[PDB]
């Protein structure tokens, strides 16, 4: 019971060998990642990486003959890109004569925080916020097959919104979003508070913030970010970050108080993704949700950045949960599904019982 | 030394397990084929077939652990379609820890008639005519890496030309071309001979024959094929087939007599493909080329229709020739090449020495 896992949906080519010692613990043997170089197609990249990225991951891992289950991403994404990992996984499966479990990409993200505790700590009736550079979704899980989208982005994601409006302020590094947070947190008190930069049910909107900041900048004193002093650009950065997060909080507060019947048994909140790394977002979440009466008490869990960002360990974990708790295996004639819905996880063709 | 071979370039999904008993003989263990149903994308078809088409081909064959070399089509064709076989072959290779040899599709066709005699009877300095529904090429091989295109189609192929102009005559079956030959050969003497239907260096042209037949039909008596008697449509079918073949012969006669230095050591002619099944084409080839003085004497070889039409056995054979006579193996980072030239066989990236 050594799980070979693959992630080939976006730009990250991931290969990870897991070790399931018993049905109570799951330490990770090996984990590889190769991202697309940018100033080369994603499908061609994955197709050229997967092969040599698995042999090295098998040479460095326990054994090449010790693999018992092959997990791969059948999930949402580019068909051509994820066919690279899928057809390769079929090749491993046929050659070793072992099962294949085609995993939903988003299911990996939602199930990943359960691996460390062997699906115990984030107990089945739970609620989750997926704040990344690509996602912005508020999901309620009732079981591994049941998932309810309570609030999702109709515009762009937080990562993009904070990176786009952050670029207007002057920041231009590798991870634009966190550099702004580090600038605000270098000296939180030294700000020009005088610079008052002041700006349906199941939806989030972010594409307006960049447009609203530019109008706020043209109305107020100066627009030239290069000439602007450090204290003034810090009161702007604080206020933009405050408004972006106030919108998320206000929509989570709206969801919880509107239908508390769905949240009667939720005892754990999971904030996963790139933006979860923000200490203000964390403190805002824990402050507001913990004081409201109608809202049920929570226990906030912030997973590591390695597991949060697209990796293969999550596919290997979600596959473990499906092979064990549902006892299902994907058919060998499996094909990529571009816009595979999460509720349409077991409705679509390809499932075969192992029980 | 059991070769797993794959063909996923066009519409035929092929998987074949070969048995190399010694470096003197090569009997074929298993061979599978699944073609695209037509009134479903070719890439999606190959991607869904390859997996289950290999497991059954491995269950019915000798063993699943007995495979020593993995041959696959890297050759010309649809990138998405042939990625299905390639990524799958990588999966087998990585899993079994065995070599991979990415084969040129056209090299399979040219090398296939050597398998039965273990590369002896069609001796190295040879000339070949590839007359199929997709090809119409006159190739000279000097070694397995050296190939000279002496005459090729600039329009459409013989198979298409005979099927398109045959359809104008009334035939509408599964294999249109051969049905016309069978109609001409049912009673070759009963024809209306009075119906005289009368119609640069390295090139063949066929798209003109259909247009020239229609003009010949409008000029002569009647066009309505339904009302037309069987004897008259037989003199048309004979004359169209005679003109199509006379053009091929005249261009082969031109090539040989223009540069006889290239043909000083050629002792064998190989006519392979769908149109090679025609007895008149065969008799025309053997008559004309055998009476001309400047042209070197030939020994005509007509391979079976199974090996001629797109299959995986040829990839497994061409791979055997490359692994043995050249001692080369393709790298695991291999990717599909859409318009891979035959002279650019070893010039392109991906080759690694096994010696
Ligand atoms: Ca099926
Ligand atoms: Ca290379
Ligand atoms: Zn993702
Ligand atoms: Zn072909």
Task: Please list every residue in chain B whose beta carbon sits closer than 8 Å to the beta carbon of residue A98.
Answer: none
Maximum pairwise Cα distance, chain A: 69
> Ligand 2 centroid vs B99 CA: distance in angstroms?
15
> 3-class SS at B205?
coil
Residues in chain B: 355
Alpha-carbon span B267 to B285, nearest angstrom: 15
Rg of chain A over Cα atoms, rounded to whole angstroms, equals 22
Q: Report CA dihedral (B270, B27, B90, B13) to the nearest 10 degrees.
A: 60
Cβ atoms < 10 Å from Cβ of B216: 17
CB contact under 8 A, A332 and B83: no
Q: How far is CA B91 from CA A334, B94, B121, in A?
A: 15, 5, 36
**Method of structure determination:** X-ray
Residue-by-residue DSSP string for A100-145:
EEEE-HHHHHHHGGGGGGTS-SS-SSEEEEEESSS-EEEEEESSSS
Name the nearest CA neighbour of B44 among A45, A86, A348: A86
Cβ atoms < 10 Å from Cβ of B89: 31
Annotated binding site of B for a divalent metal cation: 105, 109, 310
Domain A1-124+304-355 adopts which CATH fold? Nucleotidyltransferase; domain 5 (3.30.420)
Do B55 and A100 contact (CB within 8 A), yes or no?
A: no
Q: CB-based contacts of B273: which residues, under 8 Å, 6+ apart?
A: B109, B130, B131, B132, B133, B135, B159, B308, B309
What is the least distance, in Å, from the CA of B52 to any CA of chain A? 6
Domain A125-303 adopts which CATH fold? Nucleotidyltransferase; domain 5 (3.30.420)
Question: Residue written as tokens 């197709």?
Answer: A47
Contacts 24+ apart (CB under 8 A), A342-349: A342/A104, A342/A106, A342/A107, A342/A147, A342/A149, A343/A147, A345/A104, A345/A107, A345/A145, A345/A147, A346/A145
Alpha-carbon span A110 to A113, nearest angstrom: 7
Label each residue of B210-262 as H, E or C: HHHHHHHHHHCCCCCCCCCCHHHHHHHHHHHHHHHHHHHHHHHHHHHHHCCCC
Facing residue for B87 by CB, picked from A47, A94, A333 = A47
Task: Please list every residue in chain B whose beta carbon sits closer than 8 Å to the beta carbon of residue A51.
Answer: 90, 93-94, 332-334
> Ligand 1 centroid vs B50 CA: distance in angstroms?
13
Alpha-carbon span A211 to A198, nearest angstrom: 13
Parallel, antiparallel, or unpaired for β A147-153 and A203-204?
parallel
Question: Residue written as tokens 């695209």?
Answer: B36
**What are B's interface residues with A at a Cβ cutoff of 8 A?**
43-44, 47-52, 54-55, 58, 64, 67, 80, 83-84, 86-97, 331-336
Question: Residue written as tokens 């010309």?
Answer: B76
Q: Select the residue from B91, B93, B97, B338 to test the A interface by mutation, using most A Cβ atoms within 10 A.
A: B91
Question: In chain B, where does DSSP find H-type helix?
Answer: 42-59, 79-96, 105-111, 158-169, 176-184, 207-219, 230-258, 279-291, 305-308, 313-321
Do A44 and A75 contact (CB within 8 A), yes or no?
A: no
What is the least distance, in Å, from the CA of B37 to any CA of chain A? 16
The residue extents of the domains of chain B are: 1-124+304-355, 125-303
Name the nearest CA neighbour of B161 among B278, B309, B78: B278
Task: Please list every residue in chain B whose beta carbon sits closer than 8 Å to the beta carbon of residue A58.
Answer: 94
For chain B, the helix, strand and coil percentages under 3-state DSSP, each to the nearest 5? 40, 20, 40
Same fold, B1-124+304-355 and B125-303: yes
- What resolution in angstroms, rounded to 1 decimal? 2.9
Q: How far is CA B275 from CA B56, B102, B132, B140, B241, in A?
A: 32, 28, 6, 19, 11
Task: Please list every residue in chain B whose beta carbon sits closer than 8 Å to the beta carbon of residue A54.
Answer: 94
């Amino acid at each position: 019971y050594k799980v070979l896992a693959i992630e080939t949906s976006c730009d990250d080519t991931c290969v990870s060998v897991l070790d399931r010692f018993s049905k109570s613990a799951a330490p990770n043997v090996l984990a590889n990642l190769k991202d697309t170089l940018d100033s080369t197609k994603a499908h061609i990249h994955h197709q050229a990486r997967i092969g040599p990225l698995t042999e090295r991951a098998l040479i460095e891992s326990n054994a090449r003959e010790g693999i018992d289950l092959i997990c791969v991403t059948r999930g949402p994404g580019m068909p051509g890109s994820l066919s690279g990992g899928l057809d390769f996984a079929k090749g491993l499966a046929v050659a070793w004569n072992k099962p294949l479990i085609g995993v939903h990409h988003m299911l990996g993200h939602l199930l990943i925080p359960r691996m460390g505790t062997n699906g115990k700590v984030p107990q089945f009736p739970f609620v989750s916020l997926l704040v990344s550079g690509g996602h912005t979704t508020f999901v309620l899980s009732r079981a591994i097959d049941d998932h309810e989208i309570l609030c999702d982005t109709i515009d762009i994601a937080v990562g993009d919104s904070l990176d786009k409006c952050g670029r207007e302020l002057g920041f231009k590094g590798t991870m634009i979003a966190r550099e702004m947070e580090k600038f605000i947190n270098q000296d939180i008190n030294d700000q020009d508070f005088a610079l008052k930069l002041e700006m349906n049910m199941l939806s989030f909107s972010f594409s307006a913030f960049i447009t609203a900041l530019r109008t706020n900048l043209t109305k107020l004193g100066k627009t030239e970010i290069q000439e602007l002093p450090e204290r003034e650009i810090r009161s702007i950065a604080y206020q933009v970050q405050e408004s972006v997060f106030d919108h998320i909080i206000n929509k989570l507060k709206h969801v919880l108080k509107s239908q508390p019947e769905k949240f009667k048994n939720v005892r754990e909140f999971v904030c996963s993704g790139g933006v979860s790394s923000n200490q203000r977002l964390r403190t805002k979440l824990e402050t507001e949700l913990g004081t409201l009466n109608s809202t049920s008490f929570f226990n906030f869990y912030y997973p590591p950045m390695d597991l949060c960002s697209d990796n293969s360990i999550m596919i290997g974990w979600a596959g473990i949960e499906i092979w064990e708790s549902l006892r299902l295996v994907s058919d060998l004639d499996i094909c990529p599904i571009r816009q595979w819905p999460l509720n349409d996880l077991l409705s679509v063709d390809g499932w075969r019982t192992d029980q």
